[model samples]
Target chain A: MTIKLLDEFLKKHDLTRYQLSKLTGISQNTLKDQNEKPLNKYTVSILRSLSMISGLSVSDVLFELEDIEKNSDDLAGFKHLLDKYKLSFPAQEFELYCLIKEFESANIEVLPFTFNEEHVNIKKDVCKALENAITVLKEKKNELL
Target chain B: IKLLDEFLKKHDLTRYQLSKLTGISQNTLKDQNEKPLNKYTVSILRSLSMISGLSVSDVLFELEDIEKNSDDLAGFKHLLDKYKLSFPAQEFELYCLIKEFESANIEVLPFTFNRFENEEHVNIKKDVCKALENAITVLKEKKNELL
Candidate 1:
């Protein structure tokens, strides 16, 4: 997600830079810089810290620009529809694409809802992304080669 | 591992002998079967399998088993150590090319051909593979030249 969007989200969420700093343990100065330059250099540790405090995934924070801000019912309807139809996520959700790419490379097809003893564990969003990626790749593979 | 030790003993050969035959260090050979694993390379594994008349599949399965059940390979730390260390310095820098290629491939299980759109992903693989191929050829040429 872009920095401009993140700045807006922060305001809409009623979160202040100092409060977020207290929550994430990141310096207020660093937070300000990130608010200004979302594409600027950042570390995984910092992203992870923000995600932890915000009860959101790093991908959610990074891709906040694409968030739809649906109500609970809308979210439930979307989830029900997706599950009922086995629909794939749109191409705009590059975050899912990236996750699918990484998990699939590890040879994980189905994602477990919970963690297990396996070397790699797939998550819900990842499984959804893989389902979409499979459809896309299949079409391309047939067409090109 | 049991099969390997049994086969080695049946042939009246020791780790030292196999080490000499494969050009892998004797210490590594001895420790390979010991309670603790010594660092080794994929090339070493390949060469050793060839020398022992074992398949690469067998070696990989064994290594995976070690990861799952035994901590022997762990104490050794850096299972790919010898293989990693064998590369020339230039090859070391180019290793990033392999990583980037892997990243470009995106997914491995159900590889997404769509990610290869715009041919950017395909080009990454092609260029990385070419660079790696050239690097290996140079190493081989150097080996032959030295000999």
Candidate 2:
């Protein structure tokens, strides 16, 4: 019942609750309450204030929310990844680094990861390591719960 | 270093050529490439990223898999332990962007100053620069813990 979409927007823009409170003339306590509970009232005015401060149109914000709602399953999957790892921020960054390495290796033809024959071979090596790391993470996830 | 190695091969250039282009020593490049364990300084990384049209994140992400211990990394690990949970990925990205932007501004200021003095018709408004600084400061200030 939290304002999940709005919170996502704040994350994307790197806005803190205190900063948002200052920008939107809302109290810090109120913003805290809104994040934890259902956003049951004053939704439009809050959205307007956020949109104005962020320099995005209200329609644009609403559309982003719509898109996010459409990808609920993807978000849930990502959350599962987060919870399964019990990740510290650095550890999370580490996993993302590994994932990007894997993805870029797989898409070397379309991505900027490859340069020449020697470089391609090196990329293959990194990808192999990444795949191993991923298998380990997968195994770890399975062992949990 | 991997990207640099690939770039060198793709362009059929020697370490000597990149040494000339980046003003880094050929010996340094050799050292960086010889060991998968070597950590690169920001300046070297910046030069490679600039020439290759890749972002710093792109290059760093490529290098992140290699395991090495460094004083620099120790500092980063300490920072992460203190602040990592408080800040999420978006704020982390923004912090990096702000740092890069500041460094880029410093790098260009000497050139920009000379041009401003030489080109009499070019009017760089001080207020415009101040506004941009304000925006950047806002971004930096937002990194504090928020409930």
Candidate 3:
């Protein structure tokens, strides 16, 4: 069965398919197909985008899509999903992306012992604000292209 | 890391340059090459593969077949190293871009090495470095709703 668990993930995250499509470069049409049939035969990149966006693994997504019709094609399907997903960013942007990610991790490490314990909510707000800032950066990066 | 050393030699690279390219610290390489690894993480192998221009499977041949429990720091040490002695100034700009981001005050999303495998675009290096350099300036130019 080609059941789309993406719907479940989106609902859980309180996000729309269009939002994820925008976040990831995967097309909205591709994400909209929910039937247990060929989703225009998903490109490995789409599957990866789905996995990364949803925070799942390829196998996890595949397992969710499994049905009575599973067969050798499952292996082939897995292989297809194994194809590498190339990021659209050029190397320099990719490098900046790396740096931003590092900054994020460092910020995360300080969350546990944030000195202003009474202002924990504010701390969370700041973290969320930073995340939003990074999202804006990614959007701007995409706009330039 | 005989394989790594050989790869470097083949490519005429040095450990320092490799460290800069891969973002792996020099001391970490020493620990991996000289001391015993109580445990190993895929990030090390992945970074090694990416820098050597080999796939994970291709580099797996050289990985030590052992397991050791480790957490985030080592597991993701290079999540963002070495060995060509000198690259064009443009390449050095790429290295600085990464470093600058590391020192910045915001959290950034993670990037994967596989993405770098296919970039054949020219001048992208220079363009991105300058953009990153002025990211704050450009960020300010955007209307700040929070303000």
Better of 1 and 2 by lDDT: 2
Q: Is the docking of candidate 2 incorrect, acceptable, medium or high quality?
A: incorrect
lDDT of 2 by residue, B67-138 (tens): 211212212333334333223333333334333323222111211233333454432444324323444455
TM-score of chain B of 2: 0.35
Query: If ranked by DockQ, best first, what sequence of candidates would result?
Result: 2, 3, 1
lDDT winner: 2
| lDDT, residue B128, candidate 3 | 44
Give the chain A TM-score for each candidate: 0.38, 0.42, 0.33
TM-score of each: 0.24, 0.24, 0.23
What is the C-alpha DockQ of each candidate? 0.01, 0.03, 0.01
Error of 2 at B1 (Å): 68
CA lDDT of each prediction against the hidden true structure: 0.40, 0.42, 0.38
Model 2 pairs whose backbones collide: none
Between candidates 2 and 3, the one scoring higher on lDDT is 2
Tens digit per residue, CA lDDT, model 2, A4-76: 6557767877777777776545678877766653222223345445554455644454345434433332221
For residues A27-122, what per-residue lDDT tens digits would candidate 3 score against the true structure?
Answer: 678567632334323332343344444545433543333221222122222212222222122333333333332323222111111112244455
